[PDB]
Scaffold this active site. Structure first.
Site, mmCIF file in Angstrom:
data_model
loop_
_atom_site.group_PDB
_atom_site.id
_atom_site.type_symbol
_atom_site.label_atom_id
_atom_site.label_comp_id
_atom_site.label_asym_id
_atom_site.label_seq_id
_atom_site.Cartn_x
_atom_site.Cartn_y
_atom_site.Cartn_z
ATOM 1 N N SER A 104 0.823 -1.191 0.000
ATOM 2 C CA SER A 104 0.000 0.000 0.000
ATOM 3 C C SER A 104 0.867 1.255 0.000
ATOM 4 O O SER A 104 0.468 2.252 -0.575
ATOM 5 C CB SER A 104 -0.985 0.001 1.149
ATOM 6 O OG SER A 104 -1.935 -1.036 0.943
ATOM 7 N N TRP A 105 2.056 1.187 0.624
ATOM 8 C CA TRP A 105 2.956 2.334 0.673
ATOM 9 C C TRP A 105 3.231 2.900 -0.724
ATOM 10 O O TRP A 105 3.368 4.103 -0.891
ATOM 11 C CB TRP A 105 4.280 1.927 1.331
ATOM 12 C CG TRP A 105 5.293 3.030 1.342
ATOM 13 C CD1 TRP A 105 6.320 3.203 0.454
ATOM 14 C CD2 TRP A 105 5.378 4.122 2.269
ATOM 15 N NE1 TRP A 105 7.031 4.332 0.760
ATOM 16 C CE2 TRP A 105 6.472 4.919 1.862
ATOM 17 C CE3 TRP A 105 4.638 4.492 3.393
ATOM 18 C CZ2 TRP A 105 6.852 6.068 2.567
ATOM 19 C CZ3 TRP A 105 5.009 5.635 4.080
ATOM 20 C CH2 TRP A 105 6.101 6.401 3.668
ATOM 21 N N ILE B 93 -3.846 -4.578 7.235
ATOM 22 C CA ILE B 93 -4.391 -5.175 8.439
ATOM 23 C C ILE B 93 -3.394 -4.876 9.553
ATOM 24 O O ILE B 93 -2.199 -5.084 9.363
ATOM 25 C CB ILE B 93 -4.590 -6.694 8.248
ATOM 26 C CG1 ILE B 93 -5.522 -6.999 7.066
ATOM 27 C CG2 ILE B 93 -5.106 -7.330 9.542
ATOM 28 C CD1 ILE B 93 -5.459 -8.436 6.586
ATOM 29 N N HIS C 265 3.385 0.135 12.933
ATOM 30 C CA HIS C 265 3.635 0.257 11.502
ATOM 31 C C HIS C 265 2.361 0.584 10.716
ATOM 32 O O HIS C 265 2.357 1.481 9.876
ATOM 33 C CB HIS C 265 4.210 -1.068 10.988
ATOM 34 C CG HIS C 265 4.372 -1.214 9.511
ATOM 35 N ND1 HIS C 265 5.402 -0.624 8.820
ATOM 36 C CD2 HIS C 265 3.674 -1.920 8.608
ATOM 37 C CE1 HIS C 265 5.325 -0.960 7.538
ATOM 38 N NE2 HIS C 265 4.275 -1.742 7.386
ATOM 39 N N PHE D 98 -10.968 5.795 -2.944
ATOM 40 C CA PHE D 98 -10.222 5.118 -1.896
ATOM 41 C C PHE D 98 -10.823 3.739 -1.647
ATOM 42 O O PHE D 98 -11.761 3.593 -0.868
ATOM 43 C CB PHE D 98 -10.267 5.972 -0.626
ATOM 44 C CG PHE D 98 -9.322 5.545 0.470
ATOM 45 C CD1 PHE D 98 -7.950 5.672 0.318
ATOM 46 C CD2 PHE D 98 -9.802 4.994 1.651
ATOM 47 C CE1 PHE D 98 -7.070 5.292 1.324
ATOM 48 C CE2 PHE D 98 -8.918 4.620 2.663
ATOM 49 C CZ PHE D 98 -7.562 4.778 2.500
#
Lengths: 153, 153, 153, 153, 153, 153, 153
Positions: free
Chosen positions: B56-57, B82, B88, B113
């Site tokens: 996702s980063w 999750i 983090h 989104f």
């Protein structure tokens, strides 16, 4: 001392409203409230532009389009977020508030915050035309004052 | 009163999807959902561009590339985060949401989104095509509406 | 449907690594992991640039310098933050993540996040080459994929 | 592999320090620490510029002025925030950290973070020249290393 | 393998809606939702027939009349039942569901189930255009898909 | 949009009432209520047919006879079931409700449900002309509306 | 349908305010609020008459005098009652409310109720220009609307 303030008459003012559709049973009460405020303070319904978007996430990009119009004096952002089971609410609420605040500063135009951010359904009902008032009405009143202030300068 | 809204037909619309690979057993359900939504609303599968990124980063920097394409009307960001044992999750979720929101405003183009931000695996399964629907389908529907809205203007 | 993805071969790719010195007994394992990943995926050690900075706070400004180099395809940010007794950890973790995310978007270049943000020393050891893998290796693998993706475009 | 690192000699380096006055009984220890670090690492006291501001809130706008000076190699930000009874601490700490981080990236110049963000008075005393060291000394050491790194490039 | 499915475009489709008046503050939100779904999927408001009945008990006999019309492609049944103090709710909910299901099979025409059967008022509000969506919208979407499927055959 | 609804005037309408004799101290209040509703809404007492049956079990077969009469526009079924010590109540309530619902669909004629299904005697008294109204009055009002609706069509 | 409503412009309207002196630290905030409301809605400060009375008990007899003036369009009653140790509060609150209500009906002129009736000091502070708004502002807004309504008729 020089004092600048906005009066609460809406004669001549032009408004944009961006309203999300999610939680529409409540958002529709906020939109009714905003429109009623504008009209009974002397604004013309013909001078209101209403933009509907799917959810609160989409409010800022649509507000950006309205706030760039030369014939819009202030934008009222309207939506209802209610916390669910996941952290999702936190991320949406943060980005909607941050985006609207940033747009107002970038475009030097008032954008008022009529988005309910509730922990529970009851809290949202309370703020959408029941016991704790109507946040759409409140955001419209803020937009009238700020549009008048910005004229004064 | 001038009203602008988007209809839910996808005929002629071109979409970008950026989907992360982490948690792919669930992300693949979200991508299936987004594509199904586009096609059954009248979009062409040939008009979809899918970009895969590792996690996702990396979604925002890839979304930035797609949203800059003149032939893309809206970008759908898809991923599953999750919460693990450390903080983090918080930092990744914050930066992914902030980056997508900022890109949409900078480029004046809808980015929706479709990233699940779950406290538990069960919550993520619920939102990836089981009891609480499919967030990829939802993000695609939002993108169709916003692409149509932006045409109207 | 047009699909873009990155393969996991590192032949020809040039990488920057920015690694903080604080918690070096663990950061040195992450750097070893990143370098091993690059080399065994076919990258040349000669094509790696390593920048050492004192603490995680300084990673973004150094990453900014590397990511502006035309001969760097991706930057890997490496560091270890472990919560102490004060709120300090929260402020550092937030700014490091925000800065790296913002730089990636501004420069349109992948910057991957190999910074451990741990509540406890044990959690950090677990993620620096023991039971929960090696976050430096993971960030390097993400950087290889993204560098390849960005070539494809 | 190309390795860039900063040595810890301060010969020839010029530093700016921005120090808030609130909690001065502790901030004065941090400033003493920063100056001692610079001088005993070979810097000249004559090459230090010290700017005093009223509170931590004002550190970033003053740091912005120093970091724009061509004859300043690095800025050390020094202050002490201790949580009080209200949420005030959270908002100040967030904005001070965000502002300094953003300035460093915008100006491409190291700004180091010597601001204590303590939950209690005891924690602040511990980090201002007692049992957990001196955060002003630490921020100065970081600034020396980064100024040297940036010369190397 | 032969695959039959319905698309989600409502162009050309004609719908009947049967809506009960009991709990009208909520049923009116479901009817709004159904109509909005049809129109924004390309249906004509002129192609909708709305029948109002006093309570959910009366929905099936009215649905029977609409579903027998050759110019109706699908019927949407809309109502809200909330459990009271007696077993009454159980008997009404059972007969309304059984009657609609039986009519659909007898007449070989889709009849979709937009009747909320709630244990509490809160649950009904949640499903009538707040946090758990709008069951009238959902039943209309199901009716569009089934009308299209039945054309395909 | 075509809207069909029934008004609440009973002029010209002809009604059948089927009323069970068990629990007659309460059923007689429901019958009084139904007749009062019809007459004060403009119906003629001469246009009411009342059929008495021994118990709720016998209501459907008698309702079948009335609903087949061409000169009856709607049938009102009236009775009171109160749970006893055995499962008997469940079986009777299920069959009475199922039979009336099925007859209405088979004969395409409104049959309204004025049968109280109470867990306790108090609940039945409450619904037979005391604090929770009169279910016979309610069933008659529903029958007036449906008879008018069916004329409109 | 004939609809009568009052707009919220105060141009041309003349108001009386009757304000008690007891609890003046709070009543003075309510009076400020009422005057601000009138002026920023377009009323003239010169068209306001303010009558001061010792305590809430004396508000009705003074309001009677103002409401009988032909040049007063509406009266705003302002005061603060906070429950003490005895039943005294109950008797005063009852008579003040009863007297104002009766005067409005007898004189056929709006008299609005800006009297706080609080169980605690905190509740009164909340309603006198802090977290729950300003009851003097609210009573003035009500008086503007009613004065306009009564003109319309």
């Amino acid at each position: 001392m020089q004092i600048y303030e906005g009066k609460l008459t809406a004669e001549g003012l032009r408004f944009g409203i961006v309203a999300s559709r999610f939680n529409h049973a409540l958002v529709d009460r906020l939109v009714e409230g905003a429109i009623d405020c504008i009209v009974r303070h002397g604004g013309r319904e013909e001078d209101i532009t209403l933009v509907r978007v799917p959810g609160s996430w989409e409010i800022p990009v649509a507000a950006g389009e309205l706030a760039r119009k030369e014939d819009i004096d202030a934008v009222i952002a309207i939506g209802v977020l209610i916390r669910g089971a996941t952290p999702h609410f936190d991320y949406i609420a943060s980005e909607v508030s941050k985006g609207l605040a940033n747009l107002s500063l970038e475009l030097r135009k008032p954008i008022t915050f009529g988005v309910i951010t509730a922990d529970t359904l009851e809290q949202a009902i309370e703020r959408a035309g029941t016991k704790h008032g109507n946040k759409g009405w409140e955001a419209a009143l803020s937009a009238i004052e700020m549009a008048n202030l910005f004229k004064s300068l």
